[PDB]
Amino acid sequence: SRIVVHTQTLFDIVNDGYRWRKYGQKSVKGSPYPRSYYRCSSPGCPVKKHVERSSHDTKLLITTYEGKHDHDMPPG
Ligand SMILES: [Zn+2]
């Protein structure tokens, strides 16, 4: 499934309570920075997300999630 989250932050990683493994990057029209692609780190979990800084309001990080976690937020 798909859900978008916006975060007002000057940093480029958002702690969303889950753990992620980056696997690639693509260029983003209108932004200095790439879009980063991640999969959830939990074994067997189908969730993926990508993250890019906004060119409309550069205070924002735009995260797009796909899939539903088959597990709880990991410990730690
Ligand atoms: Zn997961």
**Is residue 69 part of an annotated ligand binding site?**
yes
Residues with CB under 5 A from ligand 1 (ion): 40, 42, 45, 47, 69
Q: How many CA atoms lie within 13 A of 54 on its CB side?
A: 16
Structure's resolution in angstroms: 1.6
* 30 CA from centroid of ligand 1 (Å): 30
**Elucidated via:** X-ray
CB 36 within 8 A of CB 64: no
Tell me the C-alpha distance between 31 and 18, whole Å: 26
Question: What is the DSSP-derived secondary structure letter of residue 32?
Answer: S
Q: Which structural domains are found in the chain, ordered by start?
A: 1-67 (2.20.25.80)
* 20 CA from centroid of ligand 1 (Å): 8
Inter-CA distances, 8 with 5, 42, 64, Å: 10, 26, 15
Q: Residue 11 contacts by C-beta under 8 Å, 6 or more apart in sequence? A: none
